Amino acid sequence: YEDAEAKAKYEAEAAFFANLKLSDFNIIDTLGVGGFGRVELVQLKSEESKTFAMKILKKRHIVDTRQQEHIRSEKQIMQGAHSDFIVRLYRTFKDSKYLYMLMEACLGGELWTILRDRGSFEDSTTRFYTACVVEAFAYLHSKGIIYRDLKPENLILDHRGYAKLVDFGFAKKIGFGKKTWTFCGTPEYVAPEIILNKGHDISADYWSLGILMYELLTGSPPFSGPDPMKTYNIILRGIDMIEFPKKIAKNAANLIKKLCRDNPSERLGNLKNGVKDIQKHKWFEGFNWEGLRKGTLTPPIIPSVASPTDTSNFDSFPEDNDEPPPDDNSGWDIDF
């Protein structure tokens, strides 16, 4: 906790949610669907101004895909994180078939579709979103947590236009002085030390930050092949072999190259002053970090959200008519 005021605020919030039951909520509309389950916008019956994104997961699909540890870690990390740049997980529920994760609703919409529709983001737009991620990473890395799934698809906008990290399925708390060893992530975004199975730590995230900048500035990540093997070889060749288009400002290219160092120990953010070295890079000259943290900074893209029940920034989905999944009572979900 930052201080005693924050400690007390979060304990009061936890006690507020501990008292709630699934029956205290109304379903408003669906935010997303898939084989994993659905994300529903839900409303607190006793306080209609409080709405939430409830991710409802079929437990059998989690077991089939061997993601029990991933979802347990997602719960622990997300429920324990208290950052304005990370979607809050307030609490969980469970029954025999489903897990329910009650999260902060971000009603501004998905960033990746905006990026696709515009082709690429201007320098100042990209700088705002990159700074949001930089703050989220400052928090996570201060707690020894690797995020490990940075990509435009895992950035969601709230109603103001602030970006937040969602989807902690690959996030992991790493022990002090330890590395982690699982080959996972999206191929274009995986760092070379993950490809070479040398173990990785929070510095892999700084690699991903570079990729993100490049993608946001150009519409595509810098390393890409026809199949993941060629992509991995390209990655192992290094960022210094990638052509930086003139579209990318010189300071942005410099920062990307410092983030995508082959050696994790040399990556900006992993040096003497940690994430502060990223924040002081000349690309961020004139960027109001204090205003970003205070919420006074004007986002580059303003979604309009008329009310806490407005889902107009999300696709429409027919309500669930699928067969209920089989019961799952193996017991790996005790803490939920």
Ligand X SMILES: Nc1ncnc2c1ncn2[C@@H]1O[C@H](COP(=O)(O)OP(=O)(O)NP(=O)(O)O)[C@@H](O)[C@H]1O
Contacts of 146 (CB under 8 A, 6+ apart): 140, 171, 172, 174, 180, 200, 201, 202, 204, 205
Measured distance CA(168)–CA(147) in Å, rounded = 7
Is residue 47 within 8 Å of 309, Cβ to Cβ? no
Count of residues interacting with ligand X (CB under 6 A): 17
Contacts of 113 (CB under 8 A, 6+ apart): none
Which CB sits closer to ligand X, 99 or 190? 99
- Tell me which stretch binds ligand X (CB under 6 A): 133-141, 163-171, 240-248, 281-289: 163-171
Beta carbon of residue 222, minimum distance to ligand X (angstroms, whole number): 23
Among 56, 77, 99, 103, which residue sits at the site for ligand X (rule: CB under 6 A)?
A: 103
Contact between 87 and ligand X by CB under 6 A: the answer reads yes
Which CB sits closer to ligand X, 110 or 193? 110
- Closest to 42 in 3D by CA, of 55, 26, 30: 26
From the candidates 149, 167, 205, 333, give the one annotated as an active-site residue. 149
Contacts of 143 (CB under 8 A, 6+ apart): 81, 173
Which CB sits closer to ligand X, 32 or 274? 32
Measured distance CA(62)–CA(70) in Å, rounded = 9
Among 40, 110, 167, 333, which residue sits at the site for Mn ion (rule: CB under 5 A)?
A: 167
Measured distance CA(27)–CA(213) in Å, rounded = 37
Contact between 42 and ligand X by CB under 6 A: the answer reads no
Q: Point out the annotated binding site.
A: 1, 31-39, 55
Q: Is 31 helix (H, G, I), strand (E, B) or coil?
A: strand
To the query of whether residue 149 is one of the catalytic residues in this protein, the response is yes
Is residue 121 within 8 Å of 212, Cβ to Cβ? no
Contact between 39 and ligand X by CB under 6 A: the answer reads yes
Q: Point out the annotated binding site for 3',5'-cyclic AMP.
A: 1
Beta carbon of residue 87, minimum distance to ligand X (angstroms, whole number): 5
Beta carbon of residue 136, minimum distance to ligand X (angstroms, whole number): 14
Residues at the interface with Mn ion (CB under 5 A): 167
Residues at the interface with ligand X (CB under 6 A): 31-32, 34, 36, 39, 53, 55, 87, 103-106, 110, 156, 166-167, 169
